[PDB]
Structure 1
Amino acid sequence: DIYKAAVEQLTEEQKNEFKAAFDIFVLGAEDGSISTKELGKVMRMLGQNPTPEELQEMIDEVDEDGSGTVDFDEFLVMMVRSM
């Protein structure tokens, strides 16, 4: 619940910005959630080269429903975790 705090401190504008980013990363996604596939595309689009294992790691750190995918709520937590 340490990160749950920082997400509640985010303004509606900040959340709307992340939603716009989230919305573009899920294009193609079957269920409308970031899967390792989508995450890998965003990262590579940003010049990174992650492995399947590293991608599953990033997702697992915020996968609170155990879906193996990131939904917008878990995504806001991913951003806040950065720092």
Structure 2
Amino acid sequence: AFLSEEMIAEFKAAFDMFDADGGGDISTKELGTVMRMLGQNPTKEELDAIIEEVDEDGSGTIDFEEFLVMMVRQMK
């Protein structure tokens, strides 16, 4: 009925290109790489606040469910 399709499909396109697992999880350094490709500078305060509050699935490996909730609200 009412959903955001243009920005969600562009976040998934950069995520699947920079893949650690395949279509599910990307690495801790690849979170900063995808943010530069879309339109957001990964600063020391932004990177610290995102991996510490929004957890890493394994050791340093962020997944798309918690990633898409924090990335759509901050860089909209």
Answer yes or no: is 1:79 the counterpart of 2:65: no
Unpaired runs of at least 5, structure 1: 1-10
RMSD across aligned positions (CA): 3.4
Partner of 2:14: 24
SS at 2:62 equivalent? coil
User: How far did residue 54 of structure 1 move?
Assistant: 4.9
CA contact (8 A) 2:57 2:63 kept: no
More strand as a share of residues: 2
User: How far did residue 15 of structure 1 move?
Assistant: 6.0
CA distance in 2, matches of 1:16, 1:70: 22
- Per-residue CA deviation, residues 16-69 of structure 1 (Å, 9 max, x unaligned), is 742441331342322142322222112333362534x85254133222x64233
SS at 2:13 equivalent? helix
User: How far did residue 73 of structure 1 move?
Assistant: 0.8
Specify the structure having the higher radius of gyration (Cα): 1
How many residue pairs match? The answer is 70
Unpaired runs of at least 5, structure 2: none
SS at 1:14 equivalent? coil
Percent identity between matched residues is 48
